[PDB]
Amino acid sequence: NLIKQLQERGLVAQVTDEEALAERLAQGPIALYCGFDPTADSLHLGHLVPLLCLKRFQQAGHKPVALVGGATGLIGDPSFKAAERKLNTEETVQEWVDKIRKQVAPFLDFDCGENSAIAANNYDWFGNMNVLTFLRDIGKHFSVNQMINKEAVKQRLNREDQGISFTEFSYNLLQGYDFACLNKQYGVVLQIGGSDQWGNITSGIDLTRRLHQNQVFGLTVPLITKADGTKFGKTEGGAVWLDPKKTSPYKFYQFWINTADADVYRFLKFFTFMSIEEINALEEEDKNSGKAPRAQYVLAEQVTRLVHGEEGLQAAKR
Amino acid sequence: NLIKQLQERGLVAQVTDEEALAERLAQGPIALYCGFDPTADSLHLGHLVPLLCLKRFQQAGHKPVALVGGATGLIGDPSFKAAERKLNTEETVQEWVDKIRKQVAPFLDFDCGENSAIAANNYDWFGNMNVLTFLRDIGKHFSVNQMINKEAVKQRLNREDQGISFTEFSYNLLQGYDFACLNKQYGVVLQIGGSDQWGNITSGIDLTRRLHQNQVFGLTVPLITKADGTKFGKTEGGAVWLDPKKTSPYKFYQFWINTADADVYRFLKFFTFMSIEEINALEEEDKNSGKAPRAQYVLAEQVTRLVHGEEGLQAAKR
Ligand SMILES: Nc1ncnc2c1ncn2[C@@H]1O[C@H](COS(=O)(=O)NC(=O)[C@@H](N)Cc2ccc(O)cc2)[C@@H](O)[C@H]1O
Ligand SMILES: Nc1ncnc2c1ncn2[C@@H]1O[C@H](COS(=O)(=O)NC(=O)[C@@H](N)Cc2ccc(O)cc2)[C@@H](O)[C@H]1O
């Protein structure tokens, strides 16, 4: 039902159990979540993909759970990460964490009644948890042998000079517990994220089973990348952030206008909430027409409105 | 000096930096330590070897530091262990810690003067340590790449019949920190133990250097075994404990008095404080004499007195 709708938009990289998941969603409204680690004082285009999916699920009658890694942001996710990561101060991260929680709120409904979104921070439980308690209660459920063969960290253990500290090596467990922890208190039976989080989701699905005996699910979204294969979220000396202070609403609207034809339509399915029909109708429209493709104009006005509202939209034109 | 003296009686299997350690020991009195994890309500003959070396070191004017792993006892040292060591309740380990601590006290002098022994417990700094603090403050200094090639655990990894959990895989770090922690609060520059503890000692030496820029040392005593080869401190009633309640002084004395002629002398160098001379004069004595080797007698006399004193000695004779 819903999963297939997302597949139409091309926002479905993988699914742990496409049938049971599709069935559970049928039985009734479920609660899912997606994590966001503090690596800056603001999120960017890349992050906007998963976040938007949550809203998609919510409009479908589901309850989204946007979580901020106040704790995981202090260790670093090595998932398909070329090299080690910086250990930001406990204060700097806290400052960012508080900026993310507020930057995410507007994107979700926090009072729509039943499926009201909920903001969570893994620091709440990892920020006062003992080390021995962690290793014992959570670590005993992990095999180093299989932790090594996980793609997310594969290269980092085999390769020439790609190493990995014990710090980021345990990240997997942290995000793993998060799933179970959220499932235990909020009944979250689904987690979504980029294709690079598949390994972390898996661990979360497994742990939850041997911890609460609950069949949980995971759904990764494909990592968005420009047709010209040039990553995403970043352009020149400044990755397009969501904070209008780091990326002027005017500079934001311009970024979309500059979208290549080989992407514009694919981007509309990923960053807007337009029915796949009116989107394909727009493509077939720009095709037959001998005029300039108005797809970008649409794509720019849509996203700019979602991130900066009518205000920023009118600001990007003055 | 003292190093070679220990070599004379085969109590030294490995030494990190024999040279530097030699000069340091000569420079003046130092502070060493040896850990003993609570895996039972009592210690056995095997644990007695390293414990005695602490006193031997103390008689040399150095200060021994007998540490009880009130925390590590909850994790489990996998050093050269084929299987996963089951987890004991904090209530049980705590109950064992007290017994071991009081059982160790007698063996060391806790009020002779300056070189008074110290009773340490890693639970003091690991029991109230946040997981996030541990993972980064310590974990960042450890490389999974080299943790995997560690002899102590290389068995549990490169096998398809065995396996190691994240719990015991993180043990090394705990012991590593202990050395650094002790060196920072007591100035402990040396750690001793069985050859199986070499890996844990080394890790504690590099960690101390990376966190305090100090050069500590490590010395491991050979894992004493029986001539035939069978494990040491193991009989039909299980193992030979230092706890009278578990192993009567009578049964304790009989174990020694029944020592093979090929071990009786080594054991005298390992379990007693008789000068290497009188020990050799004793061996030379038995060598050529129609009588029966009185080495066994001497052995059972000495050891039994060190573990159960006069009371337990006269108890074995009745
Ligand atoms: N270009 C892109 N296209 C699609 N998705 C993208 C993307 N760029 C980033 N993302 C996704 O958007 C999110 C960005 O935040 S993130 O720093 O990568 N998140 C993480 O690293 C997770 N470990 C955070 C986390 C998740 C769950 C937890 O229980 C705890 C922590 C991730 O889901 C990432 O996969
Ligand atoms: N038969 C034997 N001959 C000689 N030495 C022996 C022996 N049997 C055991 N030993 C040694 O005597 C001690 C017995 O206690 S133990 O439970 O094995 N100790 C451990 O496992 C350590 N990991 C404990 C530890 C040590 C230091 C720390 O900072 C923290 C913990 C160890 O040093 C062991 O190597």
- The DSSP result for B170-196, as a single string, is THHHHHHHHHHHHHHHT-EEEEEEEGG
Nearest to B224 by CA among B9, B64, B55: B9
The answer to the question of whether A265 is labelled as a binding residue is no
Distance from the Cα of residue A261 to its chain's centroid: 25
Distance CA A280, CA A278 (A): 6
Structure tokens at B29: 């009195």
Task: Determine if ligand 2 sits within 6 Å of the CB of residue B96.
Answer: no
Assess contact for A193 and A127: CB atoms under 8 A.
no
**Coil, helix or strand at residue B120:** strand
Nearest to A241 by CA among A167, A177, A307, A310: A307
Q: Kindly report the CA angle at B105 between B103 and B107, in degrees rounded to 5?
A: 90
From atom 8 of ligand 1, which residue's Cα is the shortest distance away? A46
Q: How many CB atoms lie within 10 A of CB B227?
A: 13
Contact B71 A157 (CB under 8 A): no
Distance CA A295, CA A280 (A): 10
Angle between helices A261-271 and A45-59 (to 10 degrees): 50
Assess contact for A36 and A193: CB atoms under 8 A.
no
Single-letter amino acid, residue B115 = N
Binding residues of B: 33, 171, 175, 234
Sign of CA dihedral B273, B278, B282, B287: positive
Structure tokens at B269: 């160098």
Quote the ligand 1 centre to A48 CA distance (angstroms): 10
Nearest to B74 by CA among A117, A120, A134, A192: A134
Chain B partners within 8 Å of A137 (Cβ): none
DSSP 3-state helix, strand, coil percentages of chain B (rounded to 5)?
A: 55, 10, 35
Distance CA B222, CA B317 (A): 32
Residue A259: active-site member: no
* Residues whose CB is less than 8 angstroms from the CB of residue B283 and which lie 6 or more positions away in sequence, other chains included: B265, B295
Assess contact for A48 and A242: CB atoms under 8 A.
yes
Catalytic residue among A102, A210, A212, A231: A231
* Residues whose CB is less than 8 angstroms from the CB of residue A95 and which lie 6 or more positions away in sequence, other chains included: A41
Chain A partners within 8 Å of B128 (Cβ): 130
Distance CA A267, CA A232 (A): 11
Q: Which residues pair with A18 in a beta bridge?
A: none
* Residue B289, CB-side half-sphere exposure with 13 Å CA sphere: 12
For A211-251, the DSSP string reads HH----EEEEEPPP--TTS--SS--SSS--BSSTTTS-HHH
**CATH second-level architecture of B224-318?**
Orthogonal Bundle (1.10)
Q: Which residues pair with A31 in a beta bridge?
A: A63, A188
Distance CA A311, CA A255 (A): 18
Sign of CA dihedral B124, B129, B135, B137: negative
Assess contact for B232 and B49: CB atoms under 8 A.
no
Assess contact for A258 and A252: CB atoms under 8 A.
no
Pocket of ligand 1 (CB under 6 A): A 34-37, 39, 46-47, 49-50, 67, 69, 72, 77, 122, 175, 178, 193-194, 196-197, 200, 221, 223-224, 232-233
Quote the ligand 2 centre to B65 CA distance (angstroms): 14
Quote the ligand 1 centre to B78 CA distance (angstroms): 35
Assess contact for A100 and A42: CB atoms under 8 A.
yes
Closest by Cβ to A127, choosing from B132, B136, B145: B132
CATH fold group of domain A1-223: Rossmann fold (3.40.50)
Assess contact for B259 and B299: CB atoms under 8 A.
yes
- Classify residue B214 by its DSSP letter: -
Q: Phi/psi of residue A160, each to 5°?
A: -45, -80
Nearest to A169 by CA among B314, B139, B111, B239: B139
Contact A166 B133 (CB under 8 A): no
Nearest to A195 by CA among A46, A75, A59: A46
Any idea which residue has 């992990």 for tokens?
Answer: A142
Distance CA B281, CA B279 (A): 5
Q: How many CB atoms lie within 10 A of CB B90?
A: 17
**Coil, helix or strand at residue B135:** helix
Contact B131 A126 (CB under 8 A): yes
Catalytic residue among A72, A175, A247, A296: A175
Distance CA A71, CA A89 (A): 12
Tell me the ligand closest to A177's alpha carbon: 1
Distance CA B6, CA B21 (A): 14
Contact B140 A87 (CB under 8 A): yes
Nearest to A282 by CA among A267, A228, A52: A267
Assess contact for A272 and A303: CB atoms under 8 A.
yes
Nearest to B166 by CA among A41, A91, A143: A143
What does DSSP say about strands B118-121 and B188-194: parallel, antiparallel, or unpaired? unpaired
Task: Determine if ligand 2 sits within 6 Å of the CB of residue B183.
Answer: no
Contact B128 A130 (CB under 8 A): yes
Assess contact for A55 and A107: CB atoms under 8 A.
yes
Give the residue from chain B lying closest to A85, CA to CA.
Answer: B140
Distance CA B197, CA B279 (A): 29
Assess contact for B75 and B167: CB atoms under 8 A.
yes
Structure tokens at B237: 């009633």
**Coil, helix or strand at residue B33:** strand
Domain layout of chain A by residue ranges: 1-223, 224-318
